[PDB]
């Protein structure tokens, strides 16, 4: 759940959440945990929750960086993710090469490709990789 100007967490009184900036700038709070559910949930692959919440950041400065940067599944990608550029970043970060494929189609930042087909190969499929390279002018290759 998000704060409300300065607050400090003092400690936790039950579910009816309580928060303090020091002695004012205060909360009673309907909760909304994140994480707990999550590394357990995650640990059991489970998404249902997040999803269900429809909770969806990954950036605030960043926010993918707990371990969503050091990703845990691309199932994560699925809860949230955006622009082809962003998507692309994911395409490396996850290595989401599904998103890459399209991403690629949509990339056209060469270098980007340029590494990537190999990488793609590296991960698999040269049947495809050949194409990738085909426009890439690694003709000789």
């Amino acid at each position: 759940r998000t704060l409300d100007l300065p607050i400090y967490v003092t400690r936790v009184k039950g579910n009816n959440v309580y928060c303090l900036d020091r002695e004012c700038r205060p909360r009673v709070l309907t909760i909304d945990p994140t994480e707990f559910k999550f590394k357990l949930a995650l640990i059991n692959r489970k998404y249902d929750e997040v999803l269900h919440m429809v909770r969806n950041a990954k950036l605030v400065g960043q926010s993918i960086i707990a371990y969503l940067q050091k990703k845990g599944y691309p199932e994560v990608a699925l809860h949230f993710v955006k622009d082809e550029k962003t998507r692309f970043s994911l395409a490396l970060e996850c290595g989401n090469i599904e998103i890459a494929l399209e991403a690629a189609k949509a990339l056209d930042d060469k270098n980007c490709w340029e590494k990537l087909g190999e990488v793609a190969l590296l991960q698999g499929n040269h049947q495809i990789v050949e194409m990738c390279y085909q426009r890439t002018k690694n003709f000789d290759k």
Partner: peptide
């Protein structure tokens, strides 16, 4: 507030 604004610097 509903309006929650969160921000950080990049």
């Amino acid at each position: 507030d509903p309006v929650y604004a969160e921000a950080y610097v990049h």
